[PDB]
Amino acid sequence: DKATIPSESPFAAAEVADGAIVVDIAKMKYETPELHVKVGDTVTWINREAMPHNVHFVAGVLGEAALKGPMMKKEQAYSLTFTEAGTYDYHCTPHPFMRGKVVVE
Ligand SMILES: [Cu+]
């Protein structure tokens, strides 16, 4: 695939790695809707609000299957490490008007 998953389960915001590249989620939006990172970088999303959110990449984007991330509760986090250059669109499964992309350069 074009991403690896450090933790299949969400984890606490306080447990996010020191060097972390963070996208906050609040007010029903991804706070950085267009993020540029390098090959090999790990992106971490953190839900800052009570409404559960996830990130969802449809089939063919990060790999052959869809990657439907777990639902993050308030102050939970989820990471993906990107291993190939490209542009990767994602949305929130229950709220598909929430859209973002990671541009890996
Ligand atoms: Cu959401």
From Swiss-Prot:
GO cellular component terms listed in the entry, alphabetical order: periplasmic space
Pathway(s) the chain acts in: One-carbon metabolism; methylamine degradation
Comment on bound cofactor: Binds 1 copper ion per subunit.
Binding site for Cu cation: 53, 92, 95, 98
Subcellular location: Periplasm
Keyword Cell membrane on entry: no
Chief site of localization: periplasm
Domain Plastocyanin-like per the UniProt entry, residue ranges: 1-105
Keyword set, alphabetical order: Copper, Electron transport, Metal-binding, Periplasm, Signal, Transport
Molecular function GO labels: copper ion binding; electron transfer activity
Cofactors demanded by this protein: Cu cation
Cited function: Primary acceptor of electrons from methylamine dehydrogenase. Passes those electrons on either a soluble cytochrome c or to pseudoazurin.
Name of the featured protein: Amicyanin
